[PDB]
């Protein structure tokens, strides 16, 4: 659905900025590729172009904010959402033990270019840590990620 509040748009704009390194307002294969690799992925040039083509409404070879917004505004079916939420969990769960620790969260955010203090990360872990085991499992992950 697309009944996005200005607050949500601004939040997506900041997410867009993690990709748009030079801040020119467009995401190129180079930028998309850089982010994916810092996350442990290894895409080919063709795969990157194919990904951009999916949402390239104006055919200019790059992804601009309006296109990224429409990508994020799209609503998908349950069997798609569950799998995608699982794929997302796998990214943070570096050692793959089924849980997300403070170190792993900090690692993904640091590679993305965000500067987090030691306290900020631990504060985040405790907000999502429902069962109180110091870590974050899938259920707690889904709640924090999809919040708002």
């Amino acid at each position: 659905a697309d009944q996005l509040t200005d607050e949500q748009i601004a939040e997506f704009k900041e997410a867009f900025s993690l990709f748009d390194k030079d801040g020119d307002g467009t995401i190129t294969t180079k930028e998309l590729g850089t982010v994916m690799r810092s996350l442990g992925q290894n895409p080919t040039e063709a795969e990157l172009q194919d990904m951009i083509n999916e949402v390239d409404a104006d055919g200019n070879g790059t992804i601009d904010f309006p296109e990224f917004l429409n990508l994020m505004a799209r609503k998908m079916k349950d069997t798609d959402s569950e799998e995608k939420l699982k794929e997302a969990f796998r990214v943070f769960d570096k050692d793959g033990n089924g849980f997300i620790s403070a170190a792993e969260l900090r690692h993904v955010m640091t590679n993305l270019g965000e500067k987090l203090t030691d306290e900020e990360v631990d504060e985040m872990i405790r907000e999502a840590d429902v069962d109180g085991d110091g870590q974050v499992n899938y259920e707690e992950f889904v709640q924090v990620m999809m919040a708002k």
Binding site: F12, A15, F19, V35, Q41, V55, M124, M145
Partner: peptide, 20 residues
């Protein structure tokens, strides 16, 4: 504020672009 969510949006975008 909501840095975890912002970060999550980026990761989710990649998953949506990969289109399964």
């Amino acid at each position: 504020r909501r840095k975890w969510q912002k970060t999550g949006h980026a990761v989710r975008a990649i998953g949506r672009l990969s289109s399964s």
